[PDB]
Amino acid sequence: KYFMSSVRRMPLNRAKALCSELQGTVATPRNAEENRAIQNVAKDVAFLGITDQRTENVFEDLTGNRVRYTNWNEGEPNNVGSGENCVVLLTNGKWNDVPCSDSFLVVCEFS
Amino acid sequence: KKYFMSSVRRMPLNRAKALCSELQGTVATPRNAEENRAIQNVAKDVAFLGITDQRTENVFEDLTGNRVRYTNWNEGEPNNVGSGENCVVLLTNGKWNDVPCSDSFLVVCEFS
Numbered sequence: 001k002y003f004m005s006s007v008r009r010m011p012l013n014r015a016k017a018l019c020s021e022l023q024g025t026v027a028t029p030r031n032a033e034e035n036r037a038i039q040n041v042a043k044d045v046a047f048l049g050i051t052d053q054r055t056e057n058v059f060e061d062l063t064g065n066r067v068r069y070t071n072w073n074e075g076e077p078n079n080v081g082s083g084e085n086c087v088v089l090l091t092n093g094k095w096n097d098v099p100c101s102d103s104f105l106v107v108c109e110f111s
Numbered sequence: 112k113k114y115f116m117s118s119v120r121r122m123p124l125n126r127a128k129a130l131c132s133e134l135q136g137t138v139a140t141p142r143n144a145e146e147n148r149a150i151q152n153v154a155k156d157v158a159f160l161g162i163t164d165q166r167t168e169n170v171f172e173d174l175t176g177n178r179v180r181y182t183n184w185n186e187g188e189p190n191n192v193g194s195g196e197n198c199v200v201l202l203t204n205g206k207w208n209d210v211p212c213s214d215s216f217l218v219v220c221e222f223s
């Protein structure tokens with residue numbers, strides 16, 4: 001896997017379209033090593049290819065596969081407010097669930 | 112090492128540049144036959160390369176203004192047809208053709 005970070009911020013729909021444009025997908029860490037690699041390429045908070053849009057509190061990658069490895073920041077995922085169904089990687093490498101309509105950097109994954 | 116990725120949609124060079132730059136990459140510029148073939152492997156149809164002769168006609172440079180050495184022009188190219196062809200695309204046989212920078216093609220991005 002190769003990871004590339006965007007320079008501009010955007011909602012998940014646009015982030016997905018960006019990674020897809022170059023035939024990749026939004027980065028999904030499967031272990032601590034991939035998590036670190038993604039953190040290092042990201043200079044700020046960035047979207048990961050994980051959501052619980054289909055079923056609340058059931059986090060899966062953009063292809064419907066349930067994720068095994070997680071690295072939630074203490075207190076997350078909390079689905080605050082009207083709902084948080086997307087996931088971002090904070091600058092310390094931990095994850096936070098956020099609204100899919102908010103804007104963050106994106107890290108794309110390629111094989 | 113360099114990694115090459117191809118776009119799905121067609122777009123003019125300026126847009127191709129913005130796409131590759133969005134992920135901190137550049138438009139692919141083969142420096143030898145091996146890279147040219149690697150770009151061929153990922154490009155399913157005619158695609159833009161990061162080469163132009165916009166500064167001086169018939170003096171091809173990469174997008175950073177650096178004069179290229181290796182070229183793989185298709186027989187009869189570059190011919191700068193009509194109002195001018197100052198951008199470059201990799202044909203489906205790996206050879207190159209100069210085309211208008213305003214025409215749309217797939218883009219192959221390069222990362223290191």
Ligand SMILES: OC[C@H]1O[C@H](O)[C@@H](O)[C@@H](O)[C@@H]1O
Nearest residue numbers: 075076078080084096097098
């Ligand atoms: O305090 C943590 C809390 O901060 C904000 O409200 C958002 O980033 C939430 O997603 C997060 O859970």
Ligand SMILES: OC[C@H]1O[C@H](O)[C@@H](O)[C@@H](O)[C@@H]1O
Nearest residue numbers: 188190192196208209210211
């Ligand atoms: O005959 C080859 C010629 O075909 C078209 O006119 C264009 O693709 C030109 O760039 C190319 O040189």
Ligand SMILES: [Ca+2]
Nearest residue numbers: 052079084085
């Ligand atoms: Ca949720």
Ligand SMILES: [Ca+2]
Nearest residue numbers: 078079096097
């Ligand atoms: Ca949250």
Ligand SMILES: [Ca+2]
Nearest residue numbers: 164191196197
């Ligand atoms: Ca020309």
Ligand SMILES: [Ca+2]
Nearest residue numbers: 190191208209
């Ligand atoms: Ca030509």
Ligand SMILES: [Cl-]
Nearest residue numbers: 084085099100
């Ligand atoms: Cl949401």
